[PDB]
Design a protein around this nucleic acid. Structure first.
Ligand SMILES: [Zn+2]
Length: 223
RNA sequence: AUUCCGGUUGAUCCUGCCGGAGGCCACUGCUAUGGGGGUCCGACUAAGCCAUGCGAGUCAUGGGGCGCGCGCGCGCACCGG
């Protein structure tokens, strides 16, 4: 139903969209580690239909801003939103507008266009299971003055981190994690971006084939 | 739970302090059915002052006497340990 609807009620404008429509690309993982550019949210609407449910479209922050003139004040609205599948895919976006609906739509579209793969595992001294319920090793991220460090934890220990990190990690599919932070966390944008970059940095660590089995590393979706 | 949130601008990012949110101890406001267990109750200021009653005796198998009942048995003080 939705598959054919979204696939035949849309005409692409890029070669990636053309490939995805004609059917040379079928799985979400074939678009990432080649240096492609993504300019169409329909690509992700097709290769990942889970990012269209309202259960997976958390809005993270709304802010009001001002521009002064010789007449008066012109108001603007900034919206920070996140989208994701709960099995290894997450994206973050910002949108500016004069009304909240415009802002939210633009933010969700930018979030769709900015999506990343992450790795998952156990990693902890205290669980040593091979189930991908957490991250496999400790990682660091930064944006602005905010410095985030994520550490793996055991099962049943749920997301010891602020609310924005809770939401982003829940949408990425992580269930248990410890955290340490520095800087001004009361900036939602930079806190969220630092968590996002910490998650992205799971792919910048060099591993050996043994570690994969030792930690139950999963790239993207599982089973 | 190896956690955060509010506050300096016409709007923003920092630094930096104040506050909120948790636990334990003492005093106190309002209110109060039951049982069990425990190493709780004039310590913080005056180690300031005290009426009254009690908190250290015991030995007759160490000694002499005195009283009470049929040499013997009970009771009292003293010497002595
Ligand atoms: Zn585990």
């Amino acid at each position: 139903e939705i598959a054919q609807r979204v696939l035949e009620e849309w005409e692409p404008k890029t070669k990636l969209g053309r490939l995805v429509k004609e059917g040379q690309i079928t799985d979400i993982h074939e678009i990432f580690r080649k240096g492609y550019q993504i300019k169409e949210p329909e690509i992700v609407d097709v290769l990942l239909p889970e990012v269209n449910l309202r259960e997976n479209q958390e809005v993270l922050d709304i802010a009001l801003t001002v521009r002064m003139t010789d007449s008066g004040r012109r108001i603007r609205f900034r919206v920070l939103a996140a989208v994701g599948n709960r099995d290894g895919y997450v994206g973050l976006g910002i949108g500016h507008g004069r009304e909240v609906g415009i802002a939210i739509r633009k933010a969700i579209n930018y979030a769709k266009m900015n999506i990343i793969e992450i790795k998952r595992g156990c990693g902890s001294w205290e669980c040593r299971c091979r189930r991908p319920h957490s991250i496999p090793f400790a990682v660091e991220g930064k944006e602005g003055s905010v410095r985030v460090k994520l550490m793996p934890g055991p099962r049943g220990l749920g997301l010891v981190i602020g609310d924005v990190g809770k939401k982003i990690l829940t949408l990425a599919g992580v269930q248990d994690v410890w955290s340490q932070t520095l800087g001004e966390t009361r900036t939602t944008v930079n806190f969220a971006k630092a968590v996002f970059n910490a998650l992205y940095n799971t792919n910048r660590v060099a591993i050996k084939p043994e570690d994969i089995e030792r930690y139950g590393i999963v790239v993207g979706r599982a089973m």
